[PDB]
């Protein structure tokens, strides 16, 4: 057939050693990566229809009154938000006699490998957002908060990091850490050089690295949480919900036709005429994070943060930037790149003209800054639909 093709398995190079005294399974392969978000977010029942989440909102109230003062009138209020599933899928192909032989158990092994890849794709879509389908609402890296943990974790998590949550009125309930964090917990020392997170004579593994709690909150460990320059998270993991409409749903054919090319330029091959078997796999996840601001990103040493500022349609009035809660003077939607830089460094604390950076044209600014950045657009008299987001580490 189309022998040794990149797209099908055909007694390619891999099976040169087969059906002889080959040394069992090998002694060196690592175990399959478990999903992570699927063990920390609550699973919510999801139909193929998607779901509606209701929410109360009305600021209903009562007033103190004197005798004979006529009593006031009030109204409650409610609102709703929709959530939809999204599909993830793959196909793999092998010669029918390769399926009969099943060399190195490949057609069995492949079903485990695709399951891992599909699990990993969900966690990447939830944590860093790398390829997330448009139906997924929010991802953890989209948070406007960050903290360093380098000199010792205790000050980093229990004091500084928690301050950046409770100042926003958002609580801390779990923390999620990558294996690469172990040296900075082992290196977390008092002034005498005794470790904080392990006891005398040092036989035991360091407390959070046994999934022990830190300051009451459970620790969740992982081998693959880290990306870019972020090594973990702390926050209210009750703010995340996920679902799955159905299972991984393996299906198989000896008889269909596949396009090995693209929709734009096809390259059809019949599975029947070339005598190939193909397996079809799909899963139908869904996700909602109620508020991405409820999480502190953890960083292995100090970083800058960078934001995209969007004034699309802004046509009258002024907007207000704020750094760690300290408001700038107001800015016009038409203002220059250097005007925005001069305004943010005019906040009364810690900022400087040599550390802060601003780039891009009027109304489309990008801001790079040593802190949490927030914006009030309510001074725009016309052209609502303005927004702000994080976009990378600085």
């Amino acid at each position: 057939s189309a022998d040794h093709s990149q797209i099908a398995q055909t007694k390619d190079t891999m099976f040169t050693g087969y059906l002889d005294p080959v040394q069992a399974k090998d002694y060196f392969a690592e175990a399959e990566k478990t999903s992570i978000v699927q063990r920390v977010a609550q699973k919510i029942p999801m139909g193929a229809t998607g779901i509606v989440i209701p929410h109360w909102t009305g600021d209903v109230s009562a007033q103190w009154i004197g005798e004979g003062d006529m009593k006031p009138i009030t109204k409650g209020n409610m609102t709703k938000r929709d959530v939809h599933p999204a599909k993830i899928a793959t196909i793999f192909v092998a010669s029918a006699e390769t399926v009969r032989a099943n060399p190195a158990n490949y057609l069995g092994t492949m079903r485990t490998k695709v399951a891992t890849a599909i699990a990993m794709a969900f966690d990447n879509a939830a944590l860093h957002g790398t390829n997330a389908p448009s139906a997924f609402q929010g991802y953890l890296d989209q948070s406007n908060k960050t903290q360093s943990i380098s000199p010792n974790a205790y000050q980093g998590l229990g004091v500084s990091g928690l301050t950046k949550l409770v100042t926003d009125g958002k609580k801390w309930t779990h923390t999620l850490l990558d294996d690469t964090v172990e040296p900075v917990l082992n290196g977390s020392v008092d002034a005498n050089g005794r470790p904080l997170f392990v006891e005398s004579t040092y036989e035991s593994l360091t407390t959070p690295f046994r999934e022990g709690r830190i300051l009451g909150r459970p620790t969740i460990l992982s081998d693959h949480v880290a990306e870019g320059d972020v090594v973990g998270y702390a926050g209210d993991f009750s703010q995340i919900i996920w679902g799955q409409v159905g299972g991984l749903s393996f299906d198989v054919t000896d008889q269909a036709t596949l396009n090995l090319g693209s929709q734009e330029s096809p390259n059809f091959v019949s599975l029947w005429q070339h005598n190939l078997v193909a397996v079809r796999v799909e899963a139908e996840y869904g996700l909602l994070i109620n508020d991405v601001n409820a999480f502190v990103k953890l960083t292995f040493d100090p970083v800058l943060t960078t934001y995209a500022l969007d004034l699309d349609g802004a046509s009258a009035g002024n907007f207000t930037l704020s750094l760690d809660g300290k408001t700038s003077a107001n800015i016009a939607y038409n203002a220059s790149t250097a005007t925005v830089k001069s305004a943010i460094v005019a906040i009364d604390d810690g900022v400087s003209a040599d550390d802060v950076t601003v780039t891009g044209s009027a109304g489309d600014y990008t801001i790079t800054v040593p802190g949490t950045l927030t914006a009030d657009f309510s001074g725009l008299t016309d052209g609502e639909g303005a927004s702000i987001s994080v976009v990378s580490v600085g």
């Binding site: 069992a24 399974k25 009969r100 032989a101 099943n102 060399p103 158990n105 057609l107 069995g108 079903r111 799955q244 159905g246 299972g247 991984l248 749903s249 393996f250 299906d251 198989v252």
Partner: protein, 450 residues
């Protein structure tokens, strides 16, 4: 320590790895396409016309077809053996759990897989009537699983099972759809993965060892695990006889007719059609062909291949396949000499019968342990030590020469007077353990009637 939900995937991996061995003997019993069977003298486009061969099915069937179990003997306390097959006797309860599980049916299937793959497995549980079933909820659910579905890791020191996994596949997609794990003090099951993926369930058991017994075709002590009964000798004469049938089959199409040639006479002198290189000569029976001078022409033939040159090799491979199997010579039609007399029958069967009697002993040991575990599983406490001595009673595997036994059993009994007691006449007749109990009840009635 090890977490069972990790051990699960490790045993599933070892189980899938084992399946690559079993395909080798399945291909001989189902007669699937095999490379070494293909006849080389047949031209490449005729290679689709595969000739299959039935020696391995014929042999493995002819062993498992003869085996049947009648019951068990458990030895008595201080000489009590004349007592009935009823009356709640120790040896009869272990036969009720055989009938109630229809193991009469299922064990003849399980013994066939034990020959095909060299092993099968027997498994034990109390039933869970929390799921609706057609079983008596008191009876221990002794059941049989093939090595295509259950895998068990033997400790080579004790020859005990350490642990075992049963897997089942949902449909033609060949995904796994439940995984049950047996551990020395518990049975734990990822009850289904019916879409979605699983959630666990567990039931601890009264035994101090795994409630799975391998029934295995181990042919001498050097086998820590049974070999397939389809022996390398029989495979090689199976594949040889496939080549000879396939070469002969192709020869009958291409060469059984002597090809006809004319020399000298030109194609233009015959007046062949120049677009297609032929004439439609009329060819009905009476005709004579006149071919002109042909510039000094002559007619001559290539000879036919004669198919008896292959049939003598097919006969030689049939004699070899009879020799290496040990079946009666007429089971492979290697001689038409049917045994004229009741002696000459078991003359010819003698190498089959002595083989089946060894398989009855070798499998009888598995049915000891399957019943000894099932007693402890049900009754709790400990095994009454008479059960460690229990032995299976199988049927006589020879051809049932009924009338030839009636002369002997009559003459040995000679009404009251002869050398055997009545009961021994029934044992020699081969009326079964269950039947000889039915017999006493009818004989009591004929005695009371007078």
């Amino acid at each position: 320590s090890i977490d069972p939900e990790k051990l699960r995937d490790q045993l599933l991996d070892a189980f899938e790895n084992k399946q690559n061995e079993l395909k080798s003997s399945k291909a001989y019993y189902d007669a699937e396409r095999r490379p070494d069977a293909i006849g080389l003298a047949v031209p490449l486009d005729m290679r689709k016309y595969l000739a299959h061969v039935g020696y391995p099915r014929t042999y493995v069937d002819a062993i498992a077809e003869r085996q049947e179990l009648e019951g068990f003997r458990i030895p008595s306390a201080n000489g009590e053996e004349p007592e009935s097959g009823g009356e709640n006797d120790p040896a009869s309860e272990l036969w009720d759990w055989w009938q109630a599980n229809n193991l009469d049916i299922e064990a003849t299937l399980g013994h066939t897989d034990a020959l095909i793959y060299g092993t099968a497995y027997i498994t034990i549980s109390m039933p869970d009537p929390e799921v609706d079933f057609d079983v008596d909820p008191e009876v221990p659910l002794i059941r049989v699983e093939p090595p295509t579905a259950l895998y068990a890791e033997v400790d080579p020191r004790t020859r005990k099972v350490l642990y075992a996994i049963r897997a089942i596949y949902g449909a033609d997609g060949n995904e796994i759809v439940s995984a049950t794990l047996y551990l020395p003090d518990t049975t734990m099951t990822w009850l289904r993965a019916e879409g979605e993926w699983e959630a666990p369930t567990s039931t601890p058991h009264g035994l101090e060892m795994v409630p799975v017994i391998p029934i295995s075709n181990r042919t001498r002590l050097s086998d820590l695990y049974g070999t397939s009964e389809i022996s390398p000798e029989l495979r090689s004469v199976t594949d040889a006889a496939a080549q000879i049938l396939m070469n002969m089959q192709g020869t009958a199409n291409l060469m059984a007719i002597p090809q006809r040639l004319i020399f000298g006479a030109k194609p233009e002198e015959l007046g062949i059609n120049a677009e297609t290189g032929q004439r439609m000569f009329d060819a009905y029976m009476a005709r004579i062909l006149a071919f002109e001078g042909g510039e000094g022409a002559h007619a001559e033939q290539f000879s036919a291949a004669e198919l008896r040159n292959f049939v003598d090799a097919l006969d030689a491979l049939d004699r070899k396949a009879a020799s290496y199997s040990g079946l009666p010579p007429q089971y492979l039609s290697s001689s038409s000499d049917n045994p004229a007399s009741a002696e000459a029958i078991k003359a010819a069967e003698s190498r089959l019968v002595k083989k089946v009697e060894r398989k009855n002993k070798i499998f009888g040991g598995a049915w000891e342990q399957a019943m000894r575990l099932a007693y402890k599983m049900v009754k709790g406490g400990d095994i009454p030590t008479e059960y460690y001595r229990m032995e299976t009673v199988w049927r006589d595997p020879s051809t049932p020469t009924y009338a030839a036994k009636a002369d002997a059993a009559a003459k040995l009994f000679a009404n009251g007077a002869g050398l055997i007691p009545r009961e021994r006449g029934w044992v020699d007749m081969g009326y079964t353990i269950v039947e000889r109990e039915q017999m006493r009840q009818w004989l009591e009635q004929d005695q009371k009637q007078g």
